[PDB]
Amino acid sequence: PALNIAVLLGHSHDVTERELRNLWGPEQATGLPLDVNVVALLMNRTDPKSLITHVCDLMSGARIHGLVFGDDTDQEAVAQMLDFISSQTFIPILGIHGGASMIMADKDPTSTFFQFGASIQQQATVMLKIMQDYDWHVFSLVTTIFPGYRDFISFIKTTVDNSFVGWDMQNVITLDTSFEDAKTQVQLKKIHSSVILLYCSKDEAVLILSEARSLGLTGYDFFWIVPSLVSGNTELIPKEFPSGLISVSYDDWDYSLEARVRDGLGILTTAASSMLEKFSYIPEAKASCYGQAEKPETPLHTLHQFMVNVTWDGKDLSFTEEGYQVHPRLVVIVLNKDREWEKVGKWENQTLSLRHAVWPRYKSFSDCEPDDNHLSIVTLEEAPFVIVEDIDPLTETCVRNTVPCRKFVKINNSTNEGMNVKKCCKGFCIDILKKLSRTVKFTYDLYLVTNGKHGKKVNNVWNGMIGEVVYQRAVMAVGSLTINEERSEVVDFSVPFVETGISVMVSR
Amino acid sequence: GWDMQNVITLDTSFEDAKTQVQLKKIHSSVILLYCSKDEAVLILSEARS
Amino acid sequence: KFGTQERVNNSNKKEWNGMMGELLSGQADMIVAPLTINNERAQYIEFS
Amino acid sequence: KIVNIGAVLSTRKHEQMFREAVNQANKRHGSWKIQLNATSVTHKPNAIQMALSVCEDLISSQVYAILVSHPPTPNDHFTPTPVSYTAGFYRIPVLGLTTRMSIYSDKSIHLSFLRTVPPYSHQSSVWFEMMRVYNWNHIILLVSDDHEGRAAQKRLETLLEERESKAEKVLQFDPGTKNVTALLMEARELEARVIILSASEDDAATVYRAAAMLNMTGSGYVWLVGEREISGNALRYAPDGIIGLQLINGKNESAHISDAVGVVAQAVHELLEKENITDPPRGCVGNTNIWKTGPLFKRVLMSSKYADGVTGRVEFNEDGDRKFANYSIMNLQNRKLVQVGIYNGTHVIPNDRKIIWPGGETEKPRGYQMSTRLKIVTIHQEPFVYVKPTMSDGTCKEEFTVNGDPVKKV
Amino acid sequence: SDKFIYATVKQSSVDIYFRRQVELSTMYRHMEKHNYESAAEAIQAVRD
C-alpha cells in the first residue's frame, strides 16, 4: 500500500520541493506496513479560490489520503477555510505555521482538521504555572469584549476553584468600550499591587497598556501576563509595551519549519500504520470536490480516532478530541530592557522549566521610580535558626511559616555551573526576617550563599555573608552571623537579638 | 497613642502617574487633607473615583 | 474513610471521599455519624 | 458612487423582491449621491460550489455586504457556513436572514457574521424570565453534547449566576442516540420537576418517547423547550402541556430581507460620510489582502438601529446577534398548539388563554416535590454505630439493655 | 523518635487539623506514613 501526502508551502520560506521530498527519506522503516510517497507544492499566497482549486487538484490527481498545510502569512481566516475543506473532503489537514497555526475554538464535528498550536486553556494553564512558580498568588483579571474571553474567564474560575494554592483572585474587570472616556477608569483604579492577566487584541492592548501606564499601573511590582493574541508578530513591538511583559506563545525560534513538516509527516504515517494494524486498508480519497455525489460521503473508517494515540520517535504528539495538542511546545518569553522578545521558560510534558528561578526586576520605563523597597538577602542553613526543606509534594509550593529561597546547586563538582533550586526556608531567623518585613514594609529575595561559610578574610578577600554584603551582592545577611571585631569593622551591624558566645560541649 | 500611617505630598499634577500610587497607599479610615478649594475639588473627585 | 479533600493524581482536581464523596455526589442526603466540624468541611456542606 | 450588495437567496422570486427592496431603499435615502446596485445568486447543492460562486460572482462584483438565507430544501445542516468563511477572509460583513444556528455567534470562528434573528442559545433567556414569573428555582437541563447544547447550558448558567442560583443537574447526551433511558432514570430520583430540553428534532422526539414510556409526563412536571422541539417530528411525540417558543417571523423571508436591506443601506449611507473610505477588494484570486475598512463597516452595522423595521426594531448586541425580538410562548393542548402569551425583549406578558400544564391539571405546579426518602450514609464507629451481620431471615436478633428496653436496629 | 510511634486514622478530621497547624507540621510528616485505615485497627494495634 502506497500513501500519498501533499505538503503545501509558500514562497516566503526557502524550502524547495526537492528538500520536502527528501525530508521523508530516512530509510529506517518509518512505515512498517506501508510506503509514503510525499508530493510537495508551493503557492504564492493564501486566498479562498486558489486554495480550494489547489486542494481539489491535489485530491483528484495525486489521490492524497492526507494534507499538511504550512502557511507563511498571519491570516487567521485561512485556518477556518481549511477546516471547511476538511468538512467537505474528509482528508486530514494539519496546520503547521502562520495563519494555519492559529487555534480555533470549535471545529466542525465531521471535520478531521488538526493544528500545531496551543489552545487558550493551555495558555491559561501555563500562566497559572508561571504565577505559582513565582508565588504570585494574589492577582487580578482584566478582559475585554474580544471574542474568546467568556470561555477564558470560565476556565480561569474553574482553575482557581480547584487549586490547593490560595490564588487570592481580587476581581474580574471587563472593559466593554470607552476605555478613556468613562465607566472604565473607576474599575481600573481599584487594582492594587498584584499580577494582571490581560486578554484582548494587540491594537486593543495598545490602548489598555497606555491607560494603565497613565494610571500608574506599571510599576516594578506589577507583572503583566498576556497570551499570544497580543504578542502577535515577534519582529514588531509597540513602544508602549512595558518591559517585563511576560507572554506565552508557540515557539518559532528553536522549532524550525523543517521539524514541523517532519513531525506532521510522521504523525500521518503513524496514524496510517495504526489504522492498517487495526483496520483492513486505507480508503481511497474522494473522487472530486464537485459533481454533487449522491452518497452520505461517510467513510466506514477514518483517521480521526487514530490520531488520539500518536507516538513519534522521541516525542508524544497526541491530540485531543477538540484537536489541541496534548503536549504543545509552549515558550514563556519576556520583553527585556532591549525592547526585544527574549525566551525565558519552556513548557513540555506538563513540566515548566524556567531559566530564572527568581524573577529579576525589570525597568518598565525610563521614567519609572527606582527600586528601593526590594532587597536581596543572603541566608545560610543553620539547624536552630534556618531550616531549608524541599518543595511541598502536595501544594507544590512553599508551606505556611516558610519563605521561598533559591539555592545554587550544581549537577556535580565536575561542572563549573549550577541551577537555582527554589526550596523553602524557615526557622528563627526566617521568622525574624518576616517580622522585619511586616514592620518596615519592604520586600525580599532571600537566597542561600554557596561561596563561603559564615565569612572569613582569605587573601584580603571576604567570603560568605561578609563577602556577599561587602561586594554589594546583598543588602543584608540575616542568619546565625556572629558579631566580630573584623566583621564589624568591614560591615555595619545591627543590635544583637540573642546572646551567643563560645562554649564547650562535653559528654556526660 | 496616635497611628500616623504616612505623609503624602501631591506636588505634581493630580491625574498623572504620580499622586495615584501615593493615594493608593492610604489604608487608614481617616484622612487629614490640606490644600485650597480649587485642587480640593480635584483631589476629592479622584479619591471618589 | 471519614472524608478529606484529596488531590487526585490525574488532572489535579480536588475530590471529597467517604461520607463527603457520598453526600456531595448525590448518593447521600444526610450524614448521621461522628463527623467532626471544622473550617474545611463547613465550606462545602452545612452542619447543624 | 455605485455601491454593490451581494445576496445568496433560495429562490428567484426572493431575489426579485430583494432587488425591489433595494430600489425602495435607494428611493427612500436618495440615489443622487450613491446608487445601490444589487447582485444575487441562487443556492447550489455543494458547499464547494458556493465557495467558488461567491468569489466568481459576489466578490468579483465588489460587494459591501452579503445577505445569506437557507435553501428551500428542508435540510439545515450549516448551509450558510461557506459564505461566512469566504467573506470572512476579507472581513466583509455578512447579514444572516433566517440562520438560527448559534455556532455563528462565536466571532472567533466567523470574523464577520451578523444576523437579524437571535440564535437558539438566546432562547434560554426566555426561560430565565419564566423563572421570575412562576417562581421556579430547581431545574434539570437536558442539553446535547454538540455546540448548541453547550452554548445553551453556558448561557443559562451565566444568567443564573446573577441570581446566585444554579441548576440542580446538567444532563448531557450525545446527538443521535437511540437510547436515553439512563439520563431520565438519573433525573427521576432528583427533587427538581422542571425539565428544560434543547436538542435536534430527532433527539427531542427520542427524549419525548422515552419520557412517555418512563412516566415523566404525569402531573407535577413542566417542560420548557425551544423551537426545534415543537417543530416537525418532535411535535408528533410531544407530551401534552409542553411549553415551547417560536419566533414571530423565524421562517419568514420577505420581512427579514426588507429589514436587512434597509439596515444595511442605512449603515452604508452612514459609513460613506466618513473619510478615506476604502473600496472592497475585487475578486478572490490575485488579492489576498483584507478590506481596510471592513471592521469599521462591521462596527457601523453593529451600532446601527433601524427606525421602523417590519420584523421589529432591528438592533444588534455585542455578539452580533439580534436583540429584543418578539417571542410567542406557545403551548400544546389536545395535540394542538395555541398561543398562551407573548414575550417582548425583557418581560413576559400572558393573555386570556389558560395554560394547561402536563397531566391535565390547570393549577400551576410546584417547582419541586419534597423527597421524603432520605438516603442516609453512616460510618462504622464502635461507640456510636455498631454493625452486625444478619442471619438467613434478613434481620438480626433483638436484644435488650440493662433496663430491659429493646434496642432499635435498622 | 523511632522508638515512640503515634498515629491516627488516615483521611479524618484530626489529620486535617494537624496538617493545617503551623507548629504541628513536624510530627505530621512522621505520622502520615503510619496512619491506619480505621479506628478499630488502631485500637487493636495499641492493644497489643
Ligand SMILES: *[C@@H]1O[C@H](CO)[C@@H](O[C@@H]2O[C@H](CO)[C@@H](O)[C@H](O)[C@H]2NC(C)=O)[C@H](O)[C@H]1NC(C)=O
Ligand atoms: C497507544 O499505542 C501504543 C503503541 O502501539 C500502545 O502500547 C501498546 O499497547 C498494547 C495493547 O495494550 C500492549 O500490548 C503493548 O505492550 C503496548 N506497548 C508499549 C510499548 O507499551 C498503547 O496501548 C496505545 N494506547 C491506546 C490508548 O490506544
Ligand SMILES: *[C@@H]1O[C@H](CO)[C@@H](O[C@@H]2O[C@H](CO)[C@@H](O)[C@H](O)[C@H]2NC(C)=O)[C@H](O)[C@H]1NC(C)=O
Ligand atoms: C512525561 O511526564 C510524566 C509525568 O510527569 C513523566 O513520568 C514521571 O517520570 C519521572 C521520571 O522517571 C518519575 O519520577 C515520575 O514518577 C513519573 N510520573 C508519572 C505520573 O508517571 C514522564 O517521564 C514524562 N516523559 C518524558 C519526560 O519523556
Ligand SMILES: *[C@@H]1O[C@H](CO)[C@@H](O[C@@H]2O[C@H](CO)[C@@H](O)[C@H](O)[C@H]2NC(C)=O)[C@H](O)[C@H]1NC(C)=O
Ligand atoms: C450591477 O448589477 C447588475 C445585476 O447583477 C450586474 O450585472 C451582472 O454582472 C455580472 C458580473 O459581470 C454578470 O455575471 C451578470 O450576468 C450581470 N447581470 C445581467 C442581468 O446582465 C452589474 O455588473 C452590476 N454593476 C456593477 C458596476 O457592479
Ligand SMILES: *[C@@H]1O[C@H](CO)[C@@H](O[C@@H]2O[C@H](CO)[C@@H](O)[C@H](O)[C@H]2NC(C)=O)[C@H](O)[C@H]1NC(C)=O
Ligand atoms: C436502554 O438502556 C436501559 C438500560 O440498559 C434499558 O433499561 C432496561 O430495561 C429492561 C426492560 O425494558 C429492564 O429489565 C432493565 O432492568 C433496564 N435496565 C436497567 C439498568 O434498569 C432500556 O431497555 C434500553 N432501551 C431500549 C429501547 O432497549
Ligand SMILES: *[C@@H]1O[C@H](CO)[C@@H](O[C@@H]2O[C@H](CO)[C@@H](O)[C@H](O)[C@H]2NC(C)=O)[C@H](O)[C@H]1NC(C)=O
Ligand atoms: C407508569 O404509571 C402507570 C400508572 O400510574 C403504571 O401502570 C400501573 O402500574 C401498576 C404497577 O406496575 C400496575 O399494578 C397497574 O395495573 C398499572 N396500570 C395500568 C393501567 O397499566 C405503570 O406501571 C408505570 N410505569 C412505570 C415504569 O413506573
Ligand SMILES: *[C@@H]1O[C@H](CO)[C@@H](O[C@@H]2O[C@H](CO)[C@@H](O)[C@H](O)[C@H]2NC(C)=O)[C@H](O)[C@H]1NC(C)=O
Ligand atoms: C412575511 O411578513 C411580511 C410582513 O408582515 C408579510 O407581508 C405582508 O403580507 C400581507 C398579506 O399578503 C400584506 O397585507 C402586508 O401588507 C404585507 N406586509 C409587507 C411589509 O409586505 C409576508 O406575507 C410574510 N410572509 C410569509 C410567508 O408569511
Ligand SMILES: *[C@@H]1O[C@H](CO)[C@@H](O[C@@H]2O[C@H](CO)[C@@H](O)[C@H](O)[C@H]2NC(C)=O)[C@H](O)[C@H]1NC(C)=O
Ligand atoms: C412585536 O414587535 C413590534 C415591532 O414591529 C412591536 O411594535 C412596536 O411596539 C412599540 C411598543 O409599544 C411601539 O413603540 C412601536 O411603535 C411598535 N412598532 C414598531 C415598528 O416598533 C410590538 O409591540 C411587539 N409585540 C409585543 C411586544 O408584544
Ligand SMILES: *[C@@H]1O[C@H](CO)[C@@H](O[C@@H]2O[C@H](CO)[C@@H](O)[C@H](O)[C@H]2NC(C)=O)[C@H](O)[C@H]1NC(C)=O
Ligand atoms: C415588555 O413588557 C413589559 C410589561 O408590559 C414592559 O414593562 C412595563 O413598561 C411600562 C412602560 O415603561 C411601565 O410603565 C411598566 O411599569 C412596566 N412594567 C413592568 C412589570 O416592568 C416593558 O417595558 C416591555 N419592554 C419593551 C422593550 O417593550
Ligand SMILES: *[C@@H]1O[C@H](CO)[C@@H](O)[C@H](O)[C@H]1NC(C)=O
Ligand atoms: C502566482 O503563481 C502563478 C503560478 O501558478 C504565477 O504564474 C503567478 O505569476 C504568481 N503571481 C505572482 C503575483 O507572482
Ligand SMILES: *[C@@H]1O[C@H](CO)[C@@H](O)[C@H](O)[C@H]1NC(C)=O
Ligand atoms: C572539586 O573540584 C575541585 C576543582 O574544580 C577540586 O579542587 C576539588 O578537590 C574537588 N572536590 C572533591 C573531588 O571532593
Ligand SMILES: *[C@@H]1O[C@H](CO)[C@@H](O)[C@H](O)[C@H]1NC(C)=O
Ligand atoms: C560526582 O561527585 C562525587 C562526590 O563529590 C565525586 O566523588 C565524583 O567524582 C563526581 N563525578 C565526577 C567528577 O565525574
Ligand SMILES: *[C@@H]1O[C@H](CO)[C@@H](O)[C@H](O)[C@H]1NC(C)=O
Ligand atoms: C492515581 O489515581 C488513580 C485513580 O484514583 C488510582 O487508581 C491510582 O492508584 C493512583 N496512583 C498513585 C500512584 O497515586
Ligand SMILES: *[C@@H]1O[C@H](CO)[C@@H](O)[C@H](O)[C@H]1NC(C)=O
Ligand atoms: C482615515 O480616517 C479616519 C477617520 O477620520 C482617521 O481616524 C484616520 O486617521 C484616517 N487615516 C488617514 C491615513 O488619513
